[PDB]
Design an enzyme around this catalytic site. Structure first.
Site, PDB file in Angstrom:
ATOM      1  N   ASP A 168      70.362  60.415  51.921  1.00  0.00           N
ATOM      2  CA  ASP A 168      69.722  59.690  50.825  1.00  0.00           C
ATOM      3  C   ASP A 168      70.315  58.772  50.266  1.00  0.00           C
ATOM      4  O   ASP A 168      70.868  59.081  48.752  1.00  0.00           O
ATOM      5  CB  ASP A 168      68.556  60.929  50.059  1.00  0.00           C
ATOM      6  CG  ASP A 168      68.267  60.574  48.817  1.00  0.00           C
ATOM      7  OD1 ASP A 168      67.625  59.609  48.522  1.00  0.00           O
ATOM      8  OD2 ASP A 168      67.803  61.279  47.753  1.00  0.00           O
ATOM      9  N   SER A 179      63.098  42.194  45.057  1.00  0.00           N
ATOM     10  CA  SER A 179      62.637  41.492  46.366  1.00  0.00           C
ATOM     11  C   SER A 179      61.413  39.794  45.707  1.00  0.00           C
ATOM     12  O   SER A 179      60.890  39.496  44.130  1.00  0.00           O
ATOM     13  CB  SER A 179      61.953  42.042  47.092  1.00  0.00           C
ATOM     14  OG  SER A 179      60.876  41.729  48.020  1.00  0.00           O
TER      15      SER A 179
END
Length: 330
Positions: free
Chosen positions: A35, A199
């Protein structure tokens, strides 16, 4: 040193991925959920409340000659999906794919929430976010990667998750045969303890690319892709019959649909998520309403590039003095 381990979807939907991890002496192999959005290595154990164990493999520290109680240490964690676990702490030898760390904090669960109990395939979590998020008290502990880093050939790990198929976690090297083209690296903020990046935009299907900054986290422990409501609405508007369902808890779509791809930007590069990666199947057994793999982050407080996005790429988690993230197509 290096390590290399195969990671395997837990079910036919790729709801999560498990990777075998050797703990203790002799080794006890547990299948952990790696994770990159958390920083605790915790396991089902011989200390876990019996009624809360249902099929998981447990770690038994008393059977490990290298286990030592970390005196006075406790841990307690709550995840974004509302699940939680807590317990005490041992140090022991932990190996992943041939890479060994001695003195790793292994957090033994005394209590786990229902969602963990109900998932027989996940024996615990191995956190790969920054150690500043580790919950051990009163002395915070380091992640497996943080402990291994100085020994690694290069201070990196890579995630290569499969779509409906096994993939690979590598530590200490970049497998140049595992991706196509080049790796595009992008800046990371560690201020919130995550692999947080920005992004450069998105496209839906064959549509034009929208240049827009989307801050979010690279999180292997989250199944879906969570993005701003504007972006998510633009995606689902291209699927006839798709709608946001408050009763189901997100966007659903007719199972008869053919889903468009979704592209996200990494600098000037582009990662394309095929439409099929966005199908999470019937909302309930036999239903013709299917659950979407792109969902709104509104009210989460952060955008999450979970497995839906990451499995479309070869992803480098660069733990150099100034960390960065790399993405390549594959």
């Amino acid at each position: 040193s290096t390590g290399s381990a195969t990671t395997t979807p837990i079910d036919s939907l790729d709801d999560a991925y498990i990777t075998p991890v050797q703990i203790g002496t002799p080794a006890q192999t547990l299948n952990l959920d790696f994770d990159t959005g958390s920083s605790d290595l915790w396991v089902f154990s011989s200390e876990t409340t019996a009624s809360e164990v249902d099929g998981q493999t447990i770690y038994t520290p008393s059977k490990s000659t290298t286990a030592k109680l970390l005196s006075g240490a406790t841990w307690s964690i709550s995840y974004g999906d509302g699940s939680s676990s807590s317990g005490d702490v041992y140090t022991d030898t932990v190996s992943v794919g041939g890479l060994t760390v001695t003195g790793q904090a292994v957090e033994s669960a005394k209590k786990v929430s229902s969602s963990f109990t109900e998932d027989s395939t996940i024996d615990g979590l191995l956190g790969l976010a920054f150690s500043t998020l580790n919950t051990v008290s009163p002395t915070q502990q380091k992640t497996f990667f943080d402990n291994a880093k100085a020994s690694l050939d290069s201070p990196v790990f890579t995630a290569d998750l499969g779509y409906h198929a096994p993939g690979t976690y590598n530590f200490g090297f970049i497998d140049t045969t595992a991706y196509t083209g080049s790796i595009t690296y992008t800046a990371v903020s560690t201020k919130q303890g995550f692999w947080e990046w920005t992004s450069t935009g998105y496209a839906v299907g064959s549509g034009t690319f929208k240049s827009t900054s989307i801050d979010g986290i690279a999180d292997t422990g989250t199944t879906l892709l969570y993005l701003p409501a504007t972006v998510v609405s633009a995606y689902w508007a291209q699927v006839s019959g798709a709608k946001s369902s408050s009763s189901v808890g997100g966007y659903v779509f007719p199972c008869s649909a053919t889903l468009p791809s979704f592209t996200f930007g990494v600098g000037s590069a582009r990662i394309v998520i095929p439409g099929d990666y966005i199908d999470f199947g019937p909302i309930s057994t036999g239903s013709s309403s299917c659950f979407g793999g792109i969902q709104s982050s509104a009210g989460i407080g952060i955008n999450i590039f979970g497995d839906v996005a990451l499995k479309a790429a070869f992803v480098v988690f660069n733990g150099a003095t100034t960390p960065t993230l790399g993405f390549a197509s594959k």
